[PDB]
Each structure stands twice: as structure tokens, then as C-alpha cells.
């Protein structure tokens, strides 16, 4: 009842909520160095639109550099910046750093609570069980200001928003918090699988942020099940896991020897065909929760094979600048997913990317059906009218809330995992066509046109690629097709 009214109000009063949010954001910031220079003396929406420039990351980086280096955040935000977000996008090989504060986590947990209600409205049999969720923490980078830079979900996991989260099915995992918080993701993924297998009847959902990570978890399971079952049989975690938090918390989950359970799992895994394996090991699973839009659509056939066509539920579209919104038709096919922007997240504007809309920039409530746009974001952490670099397509409207298909990220040419290699990067590499191969796991780049040539191309790519390729092992060695490989 409360949720039904909440969602009706959010998607019906879009214009009013957006206009009030802009006033809410701008009013305490009119005296910042940044907004004072565009002479926004008081809050006035037409003055904001006329005087405040639409900017790229590059335009405002001088201001962000000052905050990163320790200058008072009030140069851009009266809401103190207490950390930064590392974006998967880069500017000159360097990851972009976005300003961040707890309003990011206020919005994120608002969206978690909303999509939880959307899921349970449409999917039965989930509220009495737990999620086997392959969630990972990545260690933070220090900035000269002394504030940490983290990836979006790590900024949540390492906060009390996560530690002191609510107590219901949607925030209940088969993995202890220590496993989720473990910065060694090889150890934590193994422990995720171990705890999920031990509590296999309680699993009602499984997944990860992106479909690539869900696929990797299944491949690790395929390559680790004999060892996992030996830990279940003995009641002892393998010695190689060094994280103390994992050792202590997983030992409690194991409890003692489980040779009968081990036998049961070994009998399932021992089939030559891995088709439907997820459903056979976790028979109470109701759905797979993972993003399957954008470059992640390449993994849908693999996921359907392993999960025996359990629904793939792609819930959220977000970025280091802001969370955008959620999928209000969770049980649709992957190719049909659209995201309804939520008007309380940030003030959204849109630049037309085709001839169907001839305006220079338009408000959320004015976007035209069937037209493409680049989103523009004004947020609660010092970003004013910043271009996001994504292209979206207006597919419809839920009440008065536009729904958007994610089309692509501008200039990105190659993407396997979190990496987003764009045309400039592939250019430097070749000067020092392409295809993203996923038919084998791990996926890898393919540069059509020598062992050394493969290496120097990889060495010129960005840090996200190199962390995925050499550390997580989510990308294989780059291949120049005679066929040659990096190493
Ligand atoms: N649900 C989604 N579907 C497709 N692409 C997405 C989705 N969520 C995020 N992305 C992409 O990932 C970007 C976020 O990058 P980051 O700044 O590293 O958080 C977005 O701007 C999109 O390009």
C-alpha cells in the first residue's frame, strides 16, 4: 500500500519533483565559487538554464582536482565531499574521479528498497530465503586530500549503510559480511560458492551487479567444485584462503563435517553437461539478478544455458555521477529492458542525438518518444549540468515517467567486463579492426590485421582492463588475427 502509493507518486509527479529537486540542490550552493561565477545569485530555474554551462568531465576537472588535492569542497558543493567514486570511464588512460558524499548512498539505498518492492510484487517465493550474491569489495585508492576513492558499490559495502542495513530477505545473503568485504576477490568468490552450496536450499535468488561476473562465478564453480566439496566433507575451509575474516566466518557456516551433503553435490556436478546446473544445485532459485543490457547482453545465451531459463532480472541503470532509475517490468526479455528514471535522484536534462528532437537541451518530462539523447546530470555532490557520455532511447512512459533503453556508451569500441576501451585507446595501441570475443571464457579482445605486437597493445590500454585481465582473470590474453596471443 505504502509502496504502491510511493511509486504512483514518483512516476506521476515527475515535473514537480524534478523542479523542486533542482531548487533543493541549487539553493545552498549559490555561494559556491563555481556557481557564483555564473552569477546565479539566488535560485531561479530560468537563470540556471541560461547561465550555467553544459560541461564535460574535462571542462570541470580543474575544480575536481582541487578537491581531490584537499581544498575545501565548498568550491563546488555546500554538501561536504567525503570521498570520490572511481569511474570505469577514463580520460587519457586515467580513471575519472567523481565527487561523492552520503547523499549518493541515500539515493542508492532508496533505489534498493524500491526495486526490492518491484521484485517481490512480481516474483513469488523469495521473502523466506536468502540471496547467493557474488558481491565484491575493491580496495580503495588514496588521494592527496586523504579521502578515499572507491568504485560505487565498494563505497556502499564499506559504509554503515551496508553494515547496518535492514533485516529482510533482500539484504540477507548466504555469505557472511566478512566475505563480501574481503578485498581478495579470488578468495571471496571461492567463499561465496562454498557458503552458497552449504546453504543451498535457502537460496531463492543469485546474481551480481553485471552479467559478466555471474558467468565467471559459474566458470569458477565448474573449475572448483571438487575442492569446494572437500571443504564441505571435512568441515574445514581450504588453507590457501588467507583472509582472517573469511576464515573465522566461513568456519561457522561449515560448522562441522558434511559428508552426506558433499556426496549430494558431487553427484550433481559429476554430469558431463553443465546445462541447467544453477537450477540443479539451487532448486529454490526464483530468478537471476544481474544487468544484462548494454555490452552485458553478450552473456545472455550462456546464462540461459546454465540457469535453465530462470528469469534474468536487470533492475538498475546507474553511474558514478548518479543512479538513474529502475526497470519496472523486471520479468521481460533482456532485449526488451527499459529503465524508468527516478525523478528524486538528480536533476536530469537531455541533449538530442538525432533529428527527431531539434531543441538544444530538454527536461526529463519533455523527452520525445523514439528519440535518442545523452543524459545531463546535476547532482548532490558538486556536478552541475555534466554530460554523462551514454546514449539512451525513449521507448515509452510509465504514467508520466519516461522509460529509456540503454543504447551505448559513446566512443566505446571494446568491452568484456568492467573495461570500456574506446576508439582513442585502441588507436594508441595499434599505433604502438577489432572484435570482443566471448565464445570462450574468459573473453578477450581480437585485433584483426607479432607476439610482441599483442603485448604492447595491451600495455597501452587502461587500468580497468589491466585489473580485469591480470588480476581478476575476467579477460584473457589479447589476440591478433595467422593467430598470435599476448603474454
Ligand atoms: N543497467 C545498465 N545497462 C547498461 N549499461 C550500464 C548499466 N548500468 C551502468 N551501465 C554503464 O556503466 C556506466 C557506469 O560507469 P561507472 O561510472 O564506472 O559507474 C554507465 O554510464 C553505463 O555506460
From Swiss-Prot:
Expressed in seedlings, mostly in cotyledons, leaves, hypocotyls and sporadically in roots. Not detected in unchallenged adult plants, except in flowers. GO terms for biological process: benzoate metabolic process; cellular response to hypoxia; defense response; defense response to bacterium; detection of fungus; plant-type hypersensitive response; positive regulation of plant-type hypersensitive response; regulation of systemic acquired resistance. Specifically and reversibly inhibited by salicylic acid (SA). Keywords: Coiled coil, Hypersensitive response, Ligase, Plant defense. Disruption phenotype: Enhanced susceptibility to virulent and avirulent bacterial pathogens P.syringae pv. tomato and pv. maculicola ES4326 with or without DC3000(avrPphB, avrRpt2, avrB, avrRpm1, or avrRps4) as well as to the oomycete pathogen Hyaloperonospora parasitica (downy mildew) isolates Emoy2, Hind4, Hiks1, Wela3, Cand5, and Wand1. Impaired hyper-sensitive response (HR) and systemic acquired resistance (SAR). Compromised salicylic acid glucosides (SAG) accumulation. Resistance is partially rescued by SA treatment. Optimum pH is 8-8.5. GO terms for molecular function: N-(4-aminobenzoyl)-L-glutamate synthetase activity; N-(4-hydroxybenzoyl)-L-glutamate synthetase activity; N-benzoyl-L-glutamate synthetase activity; N-vanillate-L-glutamate synthetase activity. Interacts with the P.syringae pv. maculicola effector HopW1-1 (via C-terminus). This is 4-substituted benzoates-glutamate ligase GH3.12.
Amino acid at each position: 500500500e505504502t509502496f504502491e502509493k510511493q511509486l504512483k507518486d514518483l512516476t506521476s509527479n515527475v515535473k514537480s519533483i524534478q523542479d523542486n529537486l533542482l531548487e533543493e540542490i541549487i539553493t545552498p550552493n549559490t555561494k559556491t565559487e563555481y556557481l557564483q561565477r555564473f552569477l546565479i545569485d539566488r535560485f531561479d530555474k530560468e537563470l540556471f538554464k541560461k547561465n550555467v554551462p553544459i560541461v564535460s568531465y574535462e571542462d570541470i576537472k580543474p575544480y575536481l582536482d582541487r578537491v581531490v588535492n584537499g581544498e575545501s569542497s565548498d568550491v563546488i558543493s555546500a554538501r561536504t565531499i567525503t570521498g570520490f567514486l572511481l569511474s570505469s570511464g577514463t580520460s587519457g588512460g586515467a580513471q575519472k574521479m567523481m565527487p561523492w558524499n552520503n547523499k549518493y548512498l541515500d539515493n542508492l539505498t532508496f533505489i534498493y528498497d524500491l526495486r526490492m518492492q518491484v521484485i517481490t510484487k512480481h516474483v513469488k517465493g523469495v521473502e523466506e530465503g536468502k540471496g547467493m550474491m557474488f558481491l565484491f569489495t575493491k580496495q580503495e585508492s588514496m588521494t592527496p586530500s586523504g579521502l578515499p576513492a572507491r568504485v560505487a558499490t565498494s563505497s556502499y559495502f564499506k559504509s554503515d549503510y551496508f553494515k547496518n542495513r535492514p533485516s529482510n530477505w533482500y539484504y540477507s545473503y548466504t555469505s557472511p559480511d566478512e566475505v563480501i568485504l574481503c578485498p581478495n576477490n579470488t578468495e571471496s568468490l571461492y567463499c561465496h560458492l562454498l557458503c552458497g552450496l552449504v546453504q543451498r536450499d535457502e537460496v531463492v535468488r543469485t546474481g551480481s551487479i553485471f552479467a559478466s561476473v555471474m558467468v565467471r562465478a559459474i566458470e569458477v564453480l565448474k573449475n572448483s567444485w571438487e575442492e569446494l566439496c572437500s571443504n564441505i566433507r571435512s568441515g574445514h575451509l581450504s588453507n590457501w584462503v588467507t583472509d582472517l575474516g573469511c576464515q573465522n566466518s566461513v568456519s561457522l557456516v561449515l560448522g562441522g563435517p558434511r559428508p552426506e551433503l558433499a556426496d549430494t553435490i558431487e553427484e550433481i556436478c559429476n554430469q558431463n553437461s553443465w546445462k541447467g546446473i544453477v537450477k540443479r544445485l539451487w532448486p529454490n532459485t526464483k530468478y537471476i539478478e544481474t544487468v544484462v543490457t548494454g555490452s552485458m547482453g553478450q552473456y545472455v545465451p550462456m546464462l540461459n544455458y546454465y540457469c535453465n531459463d530462470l528469469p534474468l532480472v536487470s533492475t538498475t541503470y546507474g553511474s558514478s555521477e548518479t543512479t538513474f532509475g529502475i526497470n519496472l517490468d523486471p520479468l521481460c526479455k533482456p532485449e526488451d529492458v527499459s529503465y524508468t528514471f527516478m525523478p528524486n535522484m538528480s536533476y536530469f536534462e537531455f541533449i538530442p542525438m538525432d533529428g527527431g528532437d531539434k531543441n538544444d537541451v530538454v527536461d526529463l518530462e519533455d523527452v520525445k518518444l523514439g528519440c535518442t539523447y545523452e543524459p545531463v546530470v546535476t547532482n548532490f555532490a558538486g556536478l552541475y549540468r555534466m554530460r554523462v557520455g551514454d546514449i539512451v532511447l525513449v521507448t515509452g512512459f510509465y504514467n508520466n515517467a519516461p522509460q529509456f533503453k540503454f543504447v551505448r556508451r559513446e566512443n566505446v569500441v571494446l568491452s568484456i567486463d568492467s573495461d570500456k576501451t574506446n576508439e582513442e585507446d585502441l588507436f594508441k595501441a595499434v599505433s604502438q579492426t577489432s572484435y570482443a570475443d566471448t565464445s570462450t571464457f574468459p573473453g578477450h579482445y581480437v585485433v584483426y590485421l607479432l607476439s610482441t605486437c599483442c603485448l604492447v597493445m595491451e600495455e597501452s590500454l587502461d587500468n580497468v582492463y589491466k585489473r580485469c585481465r591480470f588480476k581478476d582473470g575476467s579477460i584473457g590474453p589479447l589476440e591478433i588475427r595467422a593467430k598470435f596471443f599476448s603474454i
